[PDB]
Structures are given as C-alpha cells and as structure tokens.
Design a protein around this ligand. Sequence first.
Ligand SMILES: [Zn+2]
Ligand SMILES: [Zn+2]
Ligand SMILES: [Zn+2]
Ligand SMILES: [Zn+2]
Lengths: 263, 265, 185, 109, 329
Amino acid sequence: LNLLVIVVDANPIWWGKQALKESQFTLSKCIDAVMVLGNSHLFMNRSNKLAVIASHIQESRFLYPGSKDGKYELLTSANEVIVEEIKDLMTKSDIKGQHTETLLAGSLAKALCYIHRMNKEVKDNQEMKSRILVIKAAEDSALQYMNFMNVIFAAQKQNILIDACVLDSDSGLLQQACDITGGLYLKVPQMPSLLQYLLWVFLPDQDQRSQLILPPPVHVDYRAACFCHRNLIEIGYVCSVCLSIFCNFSPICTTCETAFKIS
Amino acid sequence: ANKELEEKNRMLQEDPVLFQLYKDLVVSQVISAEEFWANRSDIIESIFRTYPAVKMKYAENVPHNMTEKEFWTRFFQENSNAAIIKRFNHHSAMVLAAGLRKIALNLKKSDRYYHGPTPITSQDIINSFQSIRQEMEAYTPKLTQVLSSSAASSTITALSPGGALMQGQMVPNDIQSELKHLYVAVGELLRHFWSCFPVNTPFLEEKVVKMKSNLERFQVTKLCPFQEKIRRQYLSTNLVSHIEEMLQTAYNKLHTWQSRRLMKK
Amino acid sequence: YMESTVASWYEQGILENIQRNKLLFIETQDGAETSVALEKYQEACENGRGAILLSVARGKVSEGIDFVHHYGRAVIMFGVPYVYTQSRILKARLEYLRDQFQIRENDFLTFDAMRHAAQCVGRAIRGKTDYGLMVFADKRFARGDKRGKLPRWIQEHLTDANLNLTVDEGVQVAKYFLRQMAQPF
Amino acid sequence: MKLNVDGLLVYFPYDYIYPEQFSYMRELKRTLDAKGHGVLEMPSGTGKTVSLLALIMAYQRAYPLEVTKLIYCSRTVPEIEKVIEELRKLLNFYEKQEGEKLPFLGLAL
Amino acid sequence: VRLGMMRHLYVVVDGSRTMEDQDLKPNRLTCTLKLLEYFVEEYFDQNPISQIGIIVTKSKRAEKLTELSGNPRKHITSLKKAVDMTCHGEPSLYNSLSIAMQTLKHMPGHTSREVLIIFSSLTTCDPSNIYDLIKTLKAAKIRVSVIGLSAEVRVCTVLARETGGTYHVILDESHYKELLTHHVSPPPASSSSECSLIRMGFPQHTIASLSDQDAKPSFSMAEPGLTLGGYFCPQCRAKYCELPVECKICGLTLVSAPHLARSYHHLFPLDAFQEIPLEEYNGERFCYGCQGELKDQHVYVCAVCQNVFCVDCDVFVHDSLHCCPGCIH
Ligand SMILES: [Zn+2]
Ligand SMILES: [Zn+2]
Ligand SMILES: [Zn+2]
Ligand SMILES: [Zn+2]
C-alpha cells in the first residue's frame, strides 16, 4: 500500500498578498486542488491512505488524522474534516511581526514521525511505501537550513520520497532536499492549471514512477560558502570540531576556539 | 645489489598496467626512467623455526648423495616416560621463544549552522491576514472552479516533449580503450607532479624536486598533443577536450605559482 | 598418573590438538625446571597464546603459587587428590588417629583429599573480584560426603543443576558464565 | 571508613566491606573478648588480612593490656611480604587519620 | 566533549577456525559479515567524510581485503565475496595491527585513526610480542577498540584500555547489533587527540553547456562508458562519477555541502526527554509528535518547548531524526 502525506504551505502572509492582489489563483482553489489529489489517491485503492498537514508561521497542524449528494462516505468525511479544520486554522491566528517566514521543517518532522507511527501499527504482512507531496508557496527561511537538512537525511534513511511542488518561487533548499531522497521536483508556472500536474506527475506512486515519462530533474547547485560572507566558495577549510566551511586559513576558527598548532 | 633490476623483472609481466604506463613514458623518449622508481612447505618452515637442532642438522646434512624423502623419514625417529614430558616442555618453550623475538567543547556562535552555507510593510501583513481570513467563507467549489478544459489542454501540451517543463551516443567503441589508456598515463604522472605542489615546501631540497617535476610537465605535455593529432584527423566528430583542460590548468597553476614565487622573492 | 595420562594423550591425537589450540606446559619434580616452566607460563598468560599448566596437587608449586586475574582463569582438577595407599608413614599417622581421637580412616582420608583439593582450587578467587571457574573432572566430588566436606563458600555457590554436568554441558555452561563475567559491573 | 563494630569503633582503609567482612569482624571480636583460642575460615585470599589486622589494632588500642602483641604467621616469605604491604598501607591510613605518629611497631622476621 | 568528525577506521575481521563454530543461529562468520555489511553502510550513512578499511586475518597472515575508500558499495561487495571464504587458520594480532599501522602511519594527524578488531578465536599466534607493538600504537595515537566473541581475552583487555579503546564481549546477537551500532558514532576526542584544519574541496554537478556545445566527454576516474555530465574537481579537473571521494591527484577530499551537514547532529546531541508515566495534567489525548492517542502510560517532554511525545515519537526522535519536531519551532 501507499501512505501519502500532503504538506501544504499555507502561509497567510503570501496567500493574503495574493488575496489583496485579487489574482486568479487563491488559497481556496489550492486547498481544493490538494483535496482532489487526496481523494483521487484514496480512489486508487482501498489499502491506500493519506494525510494532510498545514503550515503556518507559528505552528503546523494536521488537517486529517451520509451520501447527501450521493457521495462516497469516506471521501465525504475527508472533505468535511479538511474544510472545517483549514477554515478554523486560517480564521484564528495570532499576529507576530518578528516571525513571518513560513515554517516547513517542523511540518516535515511531524510528517516523518507520523509515517513512522503508521508503519509500526500497520501489519507486517503488507508493505507500506510512504510519500510526502510537499507543496511550497513562499520563500524559505535561512535559519531553518540545519533542521531541514536533518529531517531530509532522516527521510533518506527511512526510505520516504519528498516530492516537492514549489510554485511562484524556486527554493534551492527544497530542491536540494528532494534531490537527496530522489523525489520528483516540479515547478508549475501555471497556477490555475496546477491540478492537472498533480494527477499526472505526482499522483503516480514510486512503484510506477520508473516505468513512466516525467519531466527531467532540475540541475542542483550544491554550492558551498564561507561563514564570513555566505558567498560561493569552491575550496573550504573546515576543522575537526566545527565541521564548518570557512573562507581562508586562519590561526583559529572563531566557532571553535581550539588551540590550533601551526606547521 | 641489483634490487631495482630484480623488482623490474618481477613486475615486467606480472602486472600489465604498471609496466605499460612505465614503458609508455619511454616509448616516445620523454624523460629518463630513473625518476620513475626514484619517486615511487609450511611443515618444513615450521620445523625450521621450531627446532634449532633440526636447523643445525639440516646445515650439516644438506642433501649430498641422499634424498629428501630419507630426510623426511629421519624426522619422526620410565626413561622414555619422562622424555615425553621434557620434550613437550622444551618444544612449547621453543615455540614461545620463537614467538618472542630478541576536552569539553564550547562555542560562541551557533546560529551560523542554523543558517549554513546556503545563501539568501508592517500594515501589509495586517491587510493580507484580514483578506485571507475573509477569503474562504465559501468552500467546496470543486464542481467547476477547480479546473477548466482549456487550461488542462494547455497543461498537457506543455507536458508534451516540445512543451514547457518537459525538455525531452555510443558510436565509437575502439577509441574508448585508447582514451582510457591516455587518461591513466596522465593520472600516473600528474600524481607525482601534484604530490607536493599544494604544500609550499619553502626548502631548497624540497623545491628542487618540484622544479624537476615542473620541467617534466613540459616534457610529457610535449608528446601528448601528437597523439591528440593522430586521433583528431579521423572524423572530426566527438571532440575530446577534457584532456586539454587538465594540461592547461596544470600549466596555469605552474605559471601562476612561479609568478607568486618570484613575487615572494 | 600425570605422566601416564600425558603419554596416552600423546599416543592419541588429542594432545596435538590441545597443543594447536593453546600452549601446554608440564611440571616436573625438579625445582629449576618447575620455575622456568612457570616463568614461561606467566608470559604465555600475558600474551594471547595462553597456556595449560599441568601440575600435581601435592606439588610444591601448587601450594607456593597463587593465581590471580588472568592467571589460572579456569582451575581444572583431574581426579580426587589421594595419596598412595602404600606409603607406610601415613599408616601410622592414620591408624593412630583412628585409635586416638576416634577418626575413621576413610573419614580422615577423604578429609585429606578435600582439604588438599580446596587448597589447590581456591586460588582463582584471590582478590579484586576476578572472575573464574573451578571445574572438577571427577564424579567422586558429586558424592554428598565430598560436597559436605568442601568449603562452605564454594559449596553454597555449587548447585544440583550443575552438579554432574556432562562434558559437553559443562563446556557450554562455562562459555555462558564467561560471557556473563566478561561484561563490566 | 570507621566501622562502628559492636565491641568498639574500628578504622578501615578501603571504602567498602562486604557482609562477610562484618560477620568476620564480629566473630573475631567475640573470640578475642572470650580470650580463648578458636578457628575460623574466610574465602578471600586478600581482604581477610586487612580486616584481621585492623580489628586486632583497634582491639589493642581499646584493651592494650589484654593483648601484648600480634604474632601473624604466613606459609612462605614471598606471601608474608604481601602481608607486610597490607600492614604498611593500614598504618599509613591510621597515621593520616590521627595526624601524628603513635608508639606502634611492626616487623617481619 | 570534543568529537573527531573525520576518522579512518579499520574493521579487522579474523578468519580463524573458531569462526567455524556456529554459536550464533547461523554460522558465526556469516552472521558477522552479514551484520558488518549493515555496519559499513550505516557508518558511511552517519559519517560521510570518514572512510573505512577491512583487513582479513587468517592462517597467521593478514591480507587487506579492501583499501581505504569512500564508496560503501565496493566494501559491501568485498564482504559478500568474503562470505564464501574457507575460514581456516589462526589469526595474528601482530600481523593485523602491523598492517593497519603501516597504512595508518601516513594518514593525516587531524583525522582520528581507529581500529575495531572483531576477535573470534581467543588465541593469538604472532611472530613478535604484541606488548612491544602496544608502545608503537600509543605513540601513533591509533585507537584500538576490540570486540571479543565468547571470550574475555586479557591481551586485548590491556590493548583496549592502554590504547584508549573499549573492550566488550558479545552477550548475544541482539547485543552484537547494539555494540557495532554504538561504535558507529564518532568517539570523543581525548587529551592525546589533536585537531587541525583540513583542506576541503566542494565540486558542483555539471552537464553539457548548451545542446552539447563545447561538451566535456569523459569516462570515469576510479568498464566506465562515456559520460555527458558528472562531477568535477577544482584542481584535478578530472571527472568523478560519485561523491564524496578523495582526489586521485590532489589528495584533497571532494565532498558536497549535504555530506558535511549530515554530521552536524553529532555536534548537536539531543538532550534526553524525561519519561513521566502519569498524565501530569496532560489533557491532550492526541500525541503532539504523531497526533495519535496515547495508548500507554508514558510521556516525554523537553526542557524548552515543553511538548508531549509518545513512546514511538521519543524513540524515533532520539534514534534517527536527532531533533525535536515541535521544539524546532
Ligand atoms: Zn573549529
Ligand atoms: Zn583534485
Ligand atoms: Zn507520538
Ligand atoms: Zn522540544
């Protein structure tokens, strides 16, 4: 079976900037598209299961743990729960000017541990191939690099595919993230037509991904930079303690305070 | 002693690659071969080390009008009762004698890791927050609002090989081996040339070998382009330019460091 | 008896296999050879070769020597130590004790065996809490009288479960016990 | 490590003592108090010597007239050397505790 | 506590006869090799900059099964090949340690040289006394941490404690996994250990410039076919198939930023979360970590974020993720 987890980056600052701009694309349509993708995923097979996570500057909250319109009961429950919970989360939110960058690393951490919990509870007879369909919508924060890298390595070890679906911006950190675990990376430029992309590129699971034509991966610039400047550097002088990329040879690296002996 | 000659004879045919490259450096008469190497049963043996008496007996009784089978026969051949205990003590002692030859870490800046090497009004947040709060009072518009046929067709055309977001030769085989062999030769000589290049080595005897190797770079790169010429004039297809970058970059390092040395002087 | 057993093992292939597995040293009446052999045995113990020191219970080496951590790790007792029943000196010593102080000849003889065996097997527990196992390859020790005359500290540790282990069973339990003692406190 | 033995208070150099040591010291003090010859057995090759020596020294301090001196015999000279090492360690410990030298003499023939 | 991020470690395996004994459920040698494959891959996965080397000792002779390398797959192949080894002879600690010493003597001072001797047959027949070799090991600051099997060997006890390593004996197979996984992590740097800056090079993946114009065809550098694109070097300018790899010409380590980032969690260990079985005014039925009801009377909490985590959440967080999800916020 397959356990899909959709990490929606619903950053109120950026999405409300769209709302002010009165652009055609809106967070409501984005949520509807993600809802449709989840419904189709569960449509694929009974054993398949999904989950949803919403991201905010403060925290990240799960959006998912008759036939009035003649509808399938389970997908009806999914529709109602996600709609109500997302409206609640967006309507109620404190204001903190100091912190406005969207949070994604913690959401991915919650996702990863959730997949671990499901993998433990599920019967050993059936093998579960989990996936994380990250949907970024705003620029990332510089301060989150270390934690995001740790969670990405945890995902690599645990065999989970981070399928990034960034839109309106190309986060080098997120593209680097998906490259490590081998997840696909699609940058949709036509936001109104986003859902056609998900039902074709992302929706197919790892089992059939290899035997299918999908957009080629984007080149990843694995840049390195000194802590002095944050500028690209091809030669780094790291020590045996900090393991920090530095600019030029120095008597002692500041972040270490070690008694380096010249030679 | 001609230890170098013995070693060369040992590796003359045992290892093909080593001798192939060492010979290649002389095939075109690039440089002298001296610098090449300058820079770079059980039972009888056990008895041999076990019993010094057997060693002395072997030296005195070296095969002379006799046979090794007879020598083997001679091996196995209360007074006798104590003899076994004494022999075991002495034998174990001889074996043993043969085996006995004569900081808590502290830091001042941790946020640097939090923002690693990866590189990079107030009322706007209020406006966006309220507008997005009022955005989703209506929900479940999926029936028609989520997608439209025209945009779906445009998306499929984009996913086509000629469309956006979807961009979309092993003819030579025998040339491959020649290229591999040339690359191995470059590797062998570049190894010694770069062995002490990064280190400053501000010593006379240390710098002498670097000067000699730098001249050897001219000598080897003198013959490389001739083989390149032979290969080039075949079809003028599938250009091999990666080799040129190594030579030119080594030359650039050589000349730049020569200029830096002159500047330091 | 030691020489007879050694000779029989030498005729068979058991002794050579023991030599392969670990170095073997033997004791002799002469003190000079005894001293040299024990001196080499200590070095063998220090090194990874190991050593198997065959000795006699009445041997002066047994009483003089003391075994500590990584010395005489596993004390093996081959047969109950009994003096020959022909030495007439012990006959006076023994029958006189029967006549006076009223000690049975068998009682005193078994006491002379158990005391001697405890002397020659009690060394491995010298001090500093250094692990070690004492194996007695004789069904006689399994008899209640021998166990009763055994010192209290050893006997109380001894249990009926391991009282008469077969050779293989004893080897297995020794391996497991050494595993337990290998790990720290 | 001062042990509040039933008979009196007895010093001890090492940090801890096993219960067998408590039983040993109490039985030995019982024999000394009875002033009668007796026999007892202790498993450990080492440790019994220090317990015995410390108890005898403390008993000497408590009742110097009761015991004139201790005559401690060992099988072999190499073995008795280890005993004198133990006694020297005990004397240094007691001397540090008291802060000064006391009229105590100990020797091996 | 200072930790040596970069370490050249040698896993010395003994092809002794005693390995034949099937004390473990499968053959002892096969079990050791099968679990050592996991150890090798996990060691590379938890210390990319580091490199490993396997020396197999049998019949009183030590042979380098695989030289120092940064490619886990090559070592894994060597292990699978060694599964079928005859496994006859007697090991020699002097021979194995001398081979490791010869290779590690010329290694840089900054890196931590380490040896893990998986000792199986308690015997050690060596041409020369090993106590003398111990002196050279102490001088060379090569850490040797033996893992004995079914035996508490005295010479290896003194080896481990004198040289600074640790000695252990296998209680069982489950404990064997624990021992090797423990040795995976970098060891703390002691007083004898010294740190020094090491030159590093960061390559960038490159492909055909524009429609195969001015291409850079090349095969590989340690039956490689032509490659349109690949990694390169700042100085070698020689195409490299995979990273991280030591330069074949420069002698400078080539490694990308993520590989270095993989080792930061070692510098930042996660403080253990106190385990409180009782609810303790925790009215949140759903576990914050996994948003699942707490079916057991166990809870974990930080000293900063003060969040609630279940048994699975805390175990996973301290084992693999090495960071608190909510506390990251
Ligand atoms: Zn540092
Ligand atoms: Zn290079
Ligand atoms: Zn949980
Ligand atoms: Zn926390």
